[PDB]
Write a protein that binds this ligand. Structure first.
Ligand SMILES: CCCCCCCC/C=C/CCCCCCCC(=O)O[C@@H](COC(=O)CCCCCCCCCCCCCCCCC)COP(=O)([O-])OCC[N+](C)(C)C
Ligand SMILES: *[C@@H]1O[C@H](CO)[C@@H](O)[C@H](O)[C@H]1NC(C)=O
Ligand SMILES: *[C@@H]1O[C@H](CO)[C@@H](O)[C@H](O)[C@H]1NC(C)=O
Length: 137
């Protein structure tokens, strides 16, 4: 039960996450958080890979007040597509990524949201898992 970590807390937006991979914790921080999220947020993401990656996928589950808002699923890479990606990385490699994610800008309405982020490979193996709480105030 990995401890809660603040990914960011500024400008009326707080994002706290907990790793849900039983093997390990990881580092995630978000630059320039605010209630008005800019398009293409910059993040810093640090993890030791516990699976090999030929293809990588990201699923996001967004909920609020016990109800589903949205489900999202997107392929991040296949080996060398794009070339600058985690694909081709292997078990035991320690990765640090500092760069944008390709989100739309969003003015987050005041309230609390629950987010589940699941990163997995071509074999449906969990590479990273985080459940998060987002508070817009
Ligand atoms: C009704 C009220 C709605 C309010 C909702 C409130 C929600 C606010 C949440 C804000 C906090 C977000 C914190 C989570 C950070 C994740 C970034 C993100 O949002 O992820 C974003 C973007 O994801 C990406 O595709 C980024 C990948 C870029 C490719 C190369 C960079 C590699 C990045 C490495 C990825 C590592 C991921 C790290 C997380 C691992 C955890 C296991 C998901 O976007 P979304 O669902 O609209 O697709 C976007 C819609 N389009 C697809 C049309 C644009
Ligand atoms: C993650 O989920 C667990 C169990 O559902 C919950 O106790 C915890 O508060 C969640 N963590 C965050 C940061 O939302
Ligand atoms: C998201 O998927 C869950 C099941 O995983 C489902 O209960 C929910 O209705 C889905 N939400 C939407 C908006 O399609």
């Amino acid at each position: 039960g990995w401890p809660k970590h603040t990914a960011c807390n500024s400008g009326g937006l707080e994002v706290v996450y907990q790793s849900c991979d039983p093997l390990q914790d990881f580092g995630l921080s978000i630059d320039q958080c605010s209630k008005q999220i800019q398009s293409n947020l910059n993040i810093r993401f640090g993890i030791i890979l516990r699976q090999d990656i030929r293809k990588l996928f990201l699923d996001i589950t967004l909920m609020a007040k016990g109800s589903s808002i949205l489900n999202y699923s997107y392929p991040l890479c296949e080996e060398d597509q794009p070339k600058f990606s985690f694909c081709g990385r292997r078990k035991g490699e320690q990765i640090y990524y500092a760069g944008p994610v390709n989100n739309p800008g969003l003015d987050v309405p005041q309230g609390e949201y629950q987010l589940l982020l699941e990163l997995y490979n071509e074999n449906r193996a969990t590479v990273a898992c985080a459940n998060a709480t987002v508070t817009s105030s």
